Design a protein around this ligand. Structure first.
Ligand code: FES
Length: 95
């Protein structure tokens, strides 16, 4: 499957993401400059907030159960599992 991932912050664009591609990688192929540092699921730099839809970010490690429950997603290690809508650049909300 290929899912429509809407990325919002002067950013408002919907990209196509195969279910076996990470959202950050797909955003970069679409020319979108999203924040990152480790690209390995171990920090908050690439954090976004899921507004609708679902992801598989099982390779992540930084976010705790409670941050995941609140809708945070580490875009560098997140695969879409449905069409979804993500607010980007959300690291600041964790602190
Ligand atoms: S850039 Fe570090 S977790 Fe995504």
């Amino acid at each position: 499957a290929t899912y429509k991932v809407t990325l919002i912050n002067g950013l408002n664009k919907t990209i196509e993401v195969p279910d076996d591609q990470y959202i950050l990688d797909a955003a970069e192929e679409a020319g979108i400059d999203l924040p990152y540092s480790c690209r390995a699921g171990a920090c908050s730099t690439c954090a976004g907030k899921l507004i609708s839809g679902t992801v598989d970010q099982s390779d992540q490690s930084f976010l705790d159960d409670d941050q995941i429950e609140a809708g945070y997603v580490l875009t560098c290690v997140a695969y879409p599992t449905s069409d979804c809508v993500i607010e980007t650049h959300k690291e600041e909300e964790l602190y």
